[PDB]
Every structure is written in C-alpha cells, then in structure tokens.
Design a protein around this ligand. Structure first.
Ligand SMILES: O=C(Nc1ccc2n[nH]c(-c3ccncc3)c2c1)[C@@H]1CCN(CC(=O)N2CCN(c3ccc(-c4ncccn4)cc3)CC2)C1
Ligand SMILES: [Cl-]
Length: 351
C-alpha cells in the first residue's frame, strides 16, 4: 500500500518515504532494531526505534547514547547516520536512529562457531582499538559484552550501546557492599559488588577480559545466577584476595564477607584454557586482576605481545577532547531530558 507505515513484529516503524522495506533484526528493553533500504543513499541500513518518553531513566539512556555517538567518529565504534523524529516536541513519541548495517554480533558468532586464534586476536585488537578512542574522551562504556560488538563480512568490529556510559570520576567511585548495578551481570568486575560504582576505566578492561575468555572457550567465564553469585564465580577462579588487596577494601560488610570464605589459590589460566595461546592467557591474566588498580590499561593492552601483528600506535586514533556529563543530569525531570533529545536531534530535521 503506497505511503504505508511498515510494521515490524507489530511495531510501526514510521520512517518513510526515505526508508522502506523494513526487516526485523532484534529487540531488547531499548526498543527494536530493523534493517531498511535508504532511497537516498541506495543502500540498506540499520534503524532502531526507541520510545523512552514515559520514564526518566529511559530518557537518560537515550540522551546519553545520542550525545556520545553523535560526537564520536572511529572505525571501531558504531556511528549515527541519521535520526528521525516528529517536527514538534508534543508529537514526538519515538526516535529512530539510523546506523551502518553490520552482519552479526559476537554473541551470535560465538554461539555458531569456534574462532581461530587469528580471529580471537584480531577481534580483541579491534575492541581495544575502539576502547582506546572511547577512554581517550574519558568515557566509560560500562556494558561491554559480546552482543554489543557488531561484526561485518570483512571481520570489521564496532562497539555499540552507550546507554550506560559515563565519564571517569575517581573522586566518586566509592560505594557500599552489594550496591545495585544496572550493567550486565556476567561482565561486572568484582569491585562492583564490593565498593565501586564503576566510574574508572578499569571497569571496561575487566569486561574485555571476560570477552576474551569467552572467545577462547565459547562460554561466559563468570555466569552468575544472581547478584552475589557473580562475585562468588569470580572468586572461585581468582581465589582469595591477598592481604594487600583486602587492605584496599575498608567497607566492613565487604571485608567481613570476603574473610568468611574458604581459602583458595588462584586457578591457573592454562588449566582453565588448556588449548589457548600462552600470550592470550598472559593478557587475559592482566585484564582479570581482582584489584582494579593493578589492572592493565587499554594502551598497555594494545602493546601486549599477543597483539603484535596488528599493533600500530600511528593508526590507533584518539578523541578530539574529553567529555563531561554532570551527575545533576541524572536528576533532570524527564521532560527536560526530552527537550535535550529534541535539541540534539534537530540538526537531522526535517525528514
Ligand atoms: O546499537 C545497537 N544495535 C545495533 C546498531 C547498529 C547495527 N547495525 N547492524 C546491526 C546488527 C546487529 C546484529 N545482527 C545484525 C546486524 C546493529 C545493531 C543497540 C540497540 C540499542 N542500542 C542502544 C540505544 O539505542 N540506546 C541505549 C539504551 N536506551 C534505552 C535503554 C532502555 C530503555 C528501556 N525501555 C523500557 C524498559 C526498560 N528499558 C529505553 C531506552 C536507548 C538508547 C544499542
Ligand atoms: Cl572500600
């Protein structure tokens, strides 16, 4: 039917006439992602429909995604090509964000096949190369995991989903034991459960280490079944924290919890991953340190021997400038966040 609003799994994707021939890709709490044909550029693209305006938290994640991705430009970070929304604030219920179409994601890929060492190494390199750019703006991704790493048919990898992203804020990292956390459980560093809000760059390095382990074995390394179980999973492999590491934890409840557990020595990575490359395991070891202060940085990780075929600091760019997001943004009413989303999307108007 000419001028029809196309439906994707019962959801209207009102993106014509520029974009048509919508096909479902996937969905989540965020909304739904589809592919479409772009009649201007004459190519298929990804378009996601986000409808966040009923809740302040959904609006925070939407604004954060937009504000970061409109500024970032890097080969290993997904961009924004276009954004569609209504011409007035009152009419705007949906934001459609158009992005490059990729072939798959690392979650799908790791369910489908074992990767060669070459592919593990090269995917790792690209994750780190993207993360160097992200960290250079003092941005923390905070939700790295296989489903947020998009891959095309030439094995190019792009990092996506900046809804939980924040700025490095070591002054305010501290929190109590068992503080609720929004990012994906299996990729949470141990300190999230002990004393950390995840406001330092070490949070993302931990998640990368989890991703590397998962590329080595085709299963998540620390699949906790609930919040505290995640910490227990971690401690089952890393073993009991040393006295020095315990002395960096002054939360009484965290300390007393850790000190009640059975004494256990670190499980050797070579025993967990007996067919993996020794250099990959060395780098894994450096990423999955219990103490975040001792954890490898992104630049150090790029320079690690495992990555030597690809490492090229003349070809690993950084951001123009760091970003700032004040905590007081998190307290703005949702209609104020809506106004900001309206402003940020204005330069893609009209449709
Ligand atoms: O960017 C994202 N996905 C993309 C992108 C480009 C793609 N090209 N090709 C593919 C592809 C993937 C797999 N297989 C083949 C092809 C792409 C996938 C994801 C989808 C969503 N996105 C983040 C995002 O749009 N925001 C952060 C979360 N936020 C948000 C989060 C939660 C809620 C929420 N709403 C209701 C209940 C609970 N939470 C609302 C908004 C909206 C903004 C990351
Ligand atoms: Cl502490």
């Amino acid at each position: 039917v000419p001028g029809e609003v196309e439906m994707v799994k019962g959801q209207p994707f009102d993106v014509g006439p520029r974009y048509t021939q919508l096909q479902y890709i996937g969905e989540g709490a965020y909304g739904m992602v589809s592919s479409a044909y772009d009649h201007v550029r004459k190519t298929r693209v990804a378009i996601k429909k986000i409808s966040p305006f009923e809740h302040q938290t959904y609006c925070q994640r939407t604004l954060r995604e937009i504000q970061i991705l409109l500024r970032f430009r890097h080969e290993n970070v997904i961009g924004i090509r276009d954004i569609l929304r209504a011409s007035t604030l009152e009419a705007m219920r949906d934001v459609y964000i158009v992005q490059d179409l990729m072939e798959t994601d690392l979650y799908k890929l790791l369910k489908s096949q074992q990767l060669s060492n070459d592919h593990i190494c090269y995917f790792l390199y690209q994750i780190l190369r993207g993360l160097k750019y992200i960290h250079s703006a003092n941005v923390l991704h905070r939700d790295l995991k296989p489903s947020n790493l998009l891959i095309n048919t030439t094995c190019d990898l792009k990092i996506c989903d900046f809804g939980l992203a924040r700025i490095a804020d070591p002054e305010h990292d501290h929190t109590g034991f068992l503080t609720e956390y929004v990012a994906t459980r299996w990729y949470r560093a141990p300190e999230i459960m002990l004393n950390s809000k995840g406001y330092t760059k070490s949070i993302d390095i931990w998640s990368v280490g989890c991703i590397l382990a998962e590329m080595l074995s085709n299963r998540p390394i620390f699949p906790g079944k609930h919040y505290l179980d995640q910490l227990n999973h971690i401690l089952g492999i890393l073993g009991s924290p040393s006295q020095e590491d315990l002395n960096c934890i002054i939360n009484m409840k965290a300390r007393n919890y850790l000190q009640s557990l059975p004494s256990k020595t670190k499980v050797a990575w070579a025993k967990l991953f007996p067919k993996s490359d020794s250099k990959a395991l060395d780098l894994l070891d450096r990423m999955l340190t219990f103490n975040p202060n001792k954890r490898i940085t992104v630049e150090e990780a790029l320079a690690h021997p495992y990555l030597e075929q690809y490492y090229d600091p003349t070809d690993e760019p950084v951001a123009e400038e760091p970003f700032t997001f004040a905590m007081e943004l998190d307290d703005l009413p949702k209609e104020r966040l809506k106004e900001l989303i309206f402003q940020e999307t204005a330069r893609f108007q009209p449709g």
